[PDB]
């Protein structure tokens, strides 16, 4: 077994955010942790992006600090696999490196990883770092500049259940303040940390008792001094003999999860809350402290972190919803909100379910996820590519160029060109334009003029004009009537293409030395000659500007493009990179989308070039073939005119992205999704929270509360507290309007949904597996399977089947209904009397959470006993247990690759693949599935499904969605291919600088607490694709063994076209 | 309760 994993969509949810002076002393930065990605911003007046890096680990801890005599702040990061590091920001010119000041692994092999997980704290005097990794221990990294491998000592903590810790301000020796739990209740203790005697001395105040659910500790800075303990009913201040205690009624009805210091002295603090409310915590000084106050600011999305920036701007980082930038206002709005959203950052959120549909009924798939939870939950329609919306398309053939023409604002005209002819449209020619003063330019097959010779190549801007007659060049300037000739030169070879985008320079492509050159203007002299190599001439050339940097672009006739870094004064060409895009010669052209200039490349793979991370990205236009193009305003405004081989077209263009995400808000948690094509609509399980009434109500309007048809369950089988109310939503495939909502019984959860046909019945049903859920019980002892048909307009209940457990999973199986009922797998048949009757079942489970099928085979993913393989023996009408993996993997998602190969995600962020052993002594060696591939993903996988986002060397294609919003892809490799990739996997590790100097082999190693094996049968496509973004000096370090660097570009490129 | 624990875990709540 040989698999290749790669990322289709990087993780979107926010684990952490921190604010400080990281890039410079005078810059104010926002640092954001997504899972393995670290984002770095500068605060403007918005956010200017500077650097996004990736690490080889889940970032568990991230805080800035500044040692004595340090120019700017240093960054401390700790990963979940226990990699510690200190990073510095160094920007020596055009280049930016996150350089590793110190690094080390701080794991012990004796250890209970705790509830509340990792906690990472730094001392105010920056003398020390404190970690709580395991119960009863406390690890200490002493921060003198000598300790560069980050060697650490442990102190033993007699408190075996710690909730939160902080270092305090204003303490002689360094002092930790923490809330712990024994019986008796929860308490606050303080220890001082001796660095030289190495263990705990006793602290300032004595041990006080706090609230049963006291959960957060804020350390107030020195003007005040103590610690604030946040709990569910009360906020309290503690300092020695000082104790203030407010218990405001507002904060009762939801839990506070995050906080942030707003005013540096500590007078004001932001509080975030599980239902999305934002609070200000106000310390009123009198340098005593008289009172605490809580004021409600407004609603945000549900905050995982909070960070005040400058000037009333708060960044709200979410993991259950979109992240946002919001403005805090002195004055309330018309509804009492001091909060106002400025910007919103898409989080594909917890992906809890997804399916692949060819919605726009062409050949390209779209993902449709269940995203988010509570009021942030939504569907996301995810489409690959950049689409263009047609508004008119004249069926006109030929066409070898077009231009737009503007005396005020609007574009008005649109000029075409054909062999030797030229038609002009408002319903041969080289250029058409609007130039200085008045008049427009027009350049024909021969002359605007020279000495009976034919112009062969043209170029122009607002004020200057360069034409080429054979190898001769001329320099024209536009003056208040007709064009005065400036310069004259002859090139050593024939001119192929020409650009002068503004003008002190001139880009030129020549005919026999395959050259691209920069020439001074007017001098025409040669500032830089670059040999492109090869034996195909350039077809278009172009200089432009992407995100403040300058570039040269030269399309060759074989569809390759080159791009360099332009100087604009020196004219030097730097950092040659080469991108394949299509097979026929590309025509380059600039256009504007937002306030950015991009480039439209026209080949049989139309592409838009732009700049994301100050690197250039190439993204496909979802069009068959484009030959010419230009921007319009005349079809009408803000548009693109595009000619293909055999007709024209005009229209608008999508956001310039790799992925298009349409978002459908629901204001409740969606839980499962499935497409029913004959009804052209979607079934979505969702739940909403309602609260014990004065009699159950509903906190806000939701998708189920505002459907466009309702119904409520009819069934008489089972004859301020909160509670989930579940529904099946019917969702129009085109408008995504919620057509119908059916509500289930009180305390019934819908956990599983299918859309299938059954038996010889010609109807297509929605089938819902449910469970009766009471917090008292451990597992459910009652649930039901319900058979709905979407008739027209409304849902009617066709069948019902009571069962003795939760229906965790269901799947259509060969005309029958396979189901998991709470540690039993069962097979139902569909009678002519419209009824489910049992056929067989299987009880050798602990909790069958996950089913998938293929032919007569069934993959069963268990709560804790890993995976097992079942068969339906169709003659005997039975289940046959074929084999089983005998490892203690706690499953999250499961998928069948082929009939011999089964894929699985476990709750430790690992992937494995199981095979059928093809060995002798069948009865036991063939009853054991062998793990044949291991790989640490770093993500928790909720769903696999078969399908692909792409199609308008590898085999098969499985997408997966994760809690952190990353969408991933798995595919199969030939053995020829895996060994080659595995090879240059290890060559790339020797060359790629890893942030924190974490080793890639360690990162991807399979890791539980039972065992830690290295990864096998698995290729990290993220790592293989990083080959395209390194030096060519370092590329050649990676080609020592007949191979050439330009050859592996081809291989790695072909693999990027996979997602 | 397993169902809620599971529902929570899928959120990683």
Coordinates of C-alpha atoms in Angstrom, one line a residue, chain A residues 39 125 144 185 189 202 267 274 483 516-517 750 815 830 911 934:
Chain A
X39 CA 0.1 34.1 10.6
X125 CA 10.6 39.5 34.6
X144 CA 19.3 32.7 30.5
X185 CA -14.1 22.0 46.2
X189 CA -2.8 28.3 46.0
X202 CA 5.6 28.8 49.7
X267 CA -8.1 48.8 34.3
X274 CA -19.9 30.7 24.8
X483 CA 3.8 61.2 -33.0
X516 CA 14.6 38.4 -22.7
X517 CA 16.2 41.8 -22.3
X750 CA -30.9 12.7 14.7
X815 CA -31.0 -2.5 -1.8
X830 CA -37.8 -3.3 2.7
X911 CA -4.1 8.0 9.8
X934 CA 1.0 4.9 9.4

